[PDB]
């Protein structure tokens, strides 16, 4: 409960992920987001019917792509994101397509993606940090930043 990364003194980058997914009554739509304080680094609309979570993911794995051989230092809105990529990757990669008891295995593919996309920045810090998502800070600025873009790129499914 309550953890996080410490940022990187040094980062190249620093950027806000956020994935939006809702009910526009009837049909479920998603969107992600890639900002800075400012600016929208990336921003997608995505497949109808995907998750909140799998669209946090997306996002998340998205700015890890883009920060390929630099230091970046990225917030996560959802504790979904930041749990996930610190995840037991061993159980993602057994044989088969299932977990031990014979289950499937929740997002299994995004999740894959995610702790391959982990090592394409040089330095990474996932930061999840709530008691700054809201009021006015850089944190705070970026959190509206790449809620607000996300929940655009949805609005345009
Ligand atoms: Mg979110």
Not at 7 to 18: L, S
Not at 32 to 46: D, G, N, P, Q
């Given at each position: 409960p309550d953890l996080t990364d410490q940022?990187?003194?040094?980062?190249?980058?620093?950027?806000?992920?956020?994935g939006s997914s809702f009910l526009q009554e009837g049909q479920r739509?998603?969107?992600?987001?890639?900002?800075?304080?400012?600016?929208?680094?990336?921003?997608?609309?995505?497949?109808?019917?995907?998750?909140?979570?799998?669209?946090?993911?997306?996002?998340?794995?998205?700015?890890?792509?883009?920060?390929?051989g630099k230091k970046l230092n990225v917030y996560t809105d959802s504790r979904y994101a930041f749990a996930t990529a610190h995840v037991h990757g061993e159980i993602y990669r057994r044989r088969g397509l299932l977990t031990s008891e014979g289950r499937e295995i929740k997002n299994k593919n995004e999740i894959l993606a995610l702790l391959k996309a982990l090592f394409l920045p040089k330095r990474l810090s996932i930061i999840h940090c709530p008691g700054h998502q809201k009021g006015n800070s850089a944190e705070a600025r970026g959190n509206r930043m790449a809620d607000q873009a996300a929940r655009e790129a949805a609005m345009k499914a």
């Open positions: 940022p990187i003194p040094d980062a190249d980058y620093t950027w806000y992920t956020d739509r998603a969107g992600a987001a890639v900002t800075t304080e400012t600016e929208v680094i990336w921003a997608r609309a995505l497949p109808a019917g995907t998750s909140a979570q799998r669209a946090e993911l997306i996002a998340l794995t998205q700015a890890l792509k883009m920060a390929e």
